[PDB]
Amino acid sequence: KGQQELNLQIGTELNGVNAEIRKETEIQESLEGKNKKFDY
Amino acid sequence: IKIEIKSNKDALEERKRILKEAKEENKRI
């Protein structure tokens, strides 16, 4: 019982971490485009 | 059950590290 509940919690944490991950990727690419504009 | 729990935990850790590294890189940019 506990094993499965813990796995479900780990899945929810996975979901949150992925959300944060591609959010950070978006921020990265935004700053990167800004970097290229500043280089230009 | 057990092994899937451990695998999910581990992968979650590595993706958290990826998140933290992306945060470092965004800050540095």
The angstrom resolution of this structure is 3.6
Measured in Å, how far apart are chain A's first and last C-alpha atoms?
59
Measure B3 CA to nearest chain A CA, in Å.
10
Whole-angstrom Cα distance, residue B20 to residue B17? 5
> Are the C-beta atoms of residues A9 and B5 closer than 8 Å to each other?
no
Chain B residues near residue A16 by CB distance under 8 angstroms: none
Measured in Å, how far apart are chain B's first and last C-alpha atoms?
42
Whole-angstrom Cα distance, residue B23 to residue A23? 10
Chain A residues near residue B8 by CB distance under 8 angstroms: 7, 10-11, 14
Give me the sign of the Cα torsion angle B24, A33, A18, B3. negative
Which amino acid makes up residue B29?
Answer: I
Q: CA torsion A3→A5→A7→A9, rounded to 10°?
A: -150
* Short-list A19, A36, A17, A26, CA closest to B12: A17
Measure A37 CA to nearest chain B CA, in Å.
12
